[PDB]
């Protein structure tokens, strides 16, 4: 289907159906629309490094893609990868202009190592996103701290 | 929406860009004002009537449709989603020939 859009009334949350339109839903300004990025650790995912690395993997034939998210959650655990292959060459791409590290991290797990980079880019096995500064990417960037999460789109109440 | 995640953090300590009070003097000038890591404002939303745990699940279910939307597009960085959602919102209501008495039309005679 199309991208689900959550609608908030008071403290209740509903999912806007395309076929059924609710006139009670009011949108007076684009400033009511808000895109939120929520971390995976909030779902009870293991934050330890070996469990995390197992959630990531390399692949080729898949271009990298990026979205913008306007607001995010403070992360207890973030990650920063700097890894190569036996020949000493980097297997992770440099963060292109505009992509910075996740703005809020308590503990940042700096990771180094070497291995068989079996792909051009490193994606998320579970389909989640690597959240950066107001940008969620499908790929890990070199040397830039990140937190892994997912994005939701909202239409806030009458403010 | 009903959270199906094994655990759910009810407390949402969040950060964002949009501010409240623009009058901090000249701090709006890029030469002055916050560095890259100071532009943010923080807040705390509580799990009122399972709102947060609802959002958490919503973010999970949205992932599929979102990931496919990105596959379709060829642009590297997509910022146009929210404006697109705003347009679809209007088209839904006014696409459109509007019958007052009938449904799919938000008008009242009073």
């Amino acid at each position: 289907r199309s991208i689900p859009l959550g609608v908030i009334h008071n403290s209740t949350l509903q999912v806007s159906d395309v076929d059924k339109l609710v006139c009670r839903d009011k949108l007076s300004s684009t400033n009511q629309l808000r895109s939120v990025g929520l971390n995976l650790e909030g779902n009870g995912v293991a934050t330890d490094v070996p469990s995390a690395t197992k959630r990531w993997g390399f692949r080729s034939g898949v271009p990298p893609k990026v979205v913008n998210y306007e607001a995010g959650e403070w992360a207890e655990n973030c990650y920063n990868l700097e890894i190569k292959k036996p020949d000493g060459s980097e297997c992770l791409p440099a963060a292109p202009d505009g992509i910075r590290g996740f703005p809020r991290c308590r503990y940042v797990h700096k990771v180094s190592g070497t291995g068989p980079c079996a792909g051009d880019f490193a994606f998320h096995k579970e389909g989640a996103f690597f959240l950066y500064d107001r940008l969620a990417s499908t790929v890990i960037y070199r040397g830039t701290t990140f937190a892994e999460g997912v994005v939701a789109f909202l239409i806030l109440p009458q403010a | 929406i009903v959270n199906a995640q094994p655990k759910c953090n009810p407390n949402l300590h969040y950060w964002t860009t949009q501010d409240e009070g623009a009058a901090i003097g000249l701090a709006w000038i890029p030469y002055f004002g916050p560095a890259a890591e100071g532009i943010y404002t923080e807040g705390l939303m509580h799990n009122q009537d399972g709102l947060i745990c609802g959002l958490r699940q919503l973010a999970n279910e949205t992932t599929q449709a979102l990931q496919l939307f990105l596959r379709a597009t060829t642009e590297l960085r997509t910022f146009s989603i929210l404006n697109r959602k705003a347009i679809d919102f209007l088209l839904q209501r006014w696409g459109g020939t509007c019958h007052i008495l009938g449904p799919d039309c938000c008008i009242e005679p009073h």
Partner: antibody, heavy 125, light 114 residues
Framework: EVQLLESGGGLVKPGGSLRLSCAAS????????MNWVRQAPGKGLEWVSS????????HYADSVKGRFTISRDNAENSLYLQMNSLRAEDTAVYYC??????????????????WGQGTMVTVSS | ELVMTQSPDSLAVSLGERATINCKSS????????????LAWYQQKPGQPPKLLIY???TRESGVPDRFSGSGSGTDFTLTISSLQAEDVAVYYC?????????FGGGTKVEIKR
């Protein structure tokens, strides 16, 4: 760290009234939906009442409807239940209970992950 | 109003051997959207309030030892204790939180054979 301290209860005559109190520590009541659960002497558990964070969505057991009125104070981090027109069948141990964070008055419920120490309520002439 | 039924009412097993407790609901507690069975298990020792053991029928709560494990879906469910030991002597209740009013089973008393 996380716990619930209960007050009130005791002896009361049939038709009398009592007010159970429950004070939370280690978390904020705003995040969770609170419940009351009773347990008659030597018998099983019976759900009594529930109240959402916003205090918007409230529910009682049919056997209790109209006689009990549940309430909460998020700022004071407390939960209260006022019981009126008490009778013998209400004689039981009343537990202050926290429901999971996934519970909402307008959707599916959640489990009772934290239980209070309990308080004895005896209805007798 | 769902009626939860536990069996057996009482059970006595030798230390180190396994014990199983059944639970039967009047109606299916399976949520179509989640494919999650909304059922919970509690432990209540004498003079103490209940303690959460299992939620969503199969998922152990944090801190519950591995020997506790639940299973089943829809109508029939089971709580299983492998290697009973001493600290597991209690009354075990099953509960549905699929639809209101939330209801408990009659409870099962687990004792040790000596």
């Amino acid at each position: 760290e996380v716990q619930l301290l209960e007050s009130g209860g005791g002896l009361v005559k049939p038709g009398g009234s009592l007010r159970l109190s429950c004070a939370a520590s280690g978390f904020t009541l705003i995040n969770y939906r609170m419940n009351w659960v009773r347990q008659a002497p030597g018998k099983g558990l019976e759900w009594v009442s529930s109240i959402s964070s916003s205090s918007s969505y409230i529910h009682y057991a049919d056997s209790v409807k109209g006689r009990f009125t549940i309430s909460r104070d998020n700022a004071e981090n407390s939960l209260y239940l006022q019981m009126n027109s008490l009778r013998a069948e209400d004689t039981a141990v009343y537990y202050c209970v926290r429901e999971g964070p996934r519970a909402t008055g307008y959707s599916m419920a959640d489990v009772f992950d934290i239980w209070g120490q309990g308080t004895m309520v005896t209805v007798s002439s | 109003e769902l009626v939860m039924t536990q069996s057996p009412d009482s059970l006595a097993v030798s230390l180190g051997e396994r014990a199983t407790i059944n639970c039967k609901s009047s109606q299916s507690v399976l949520y179509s959207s989640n494919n999650k069975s909304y059922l919970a298990w509690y432990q209540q020792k004498p003079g103490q309030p209940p303690k959460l053991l299992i939620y969503w029928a199969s998922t152990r709560e944090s801190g519950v030892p591995d020997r506790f494990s639940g299973s089943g879906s829809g109508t029939d469910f089971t709580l299983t204790i492998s290697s009973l030991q001493a600290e597991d002597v209690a009354v075990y209740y099953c509960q549905q939180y699929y639809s209101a009013p939330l209801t408990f089973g009659g409870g099962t008393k687990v004792e040790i054979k000596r």
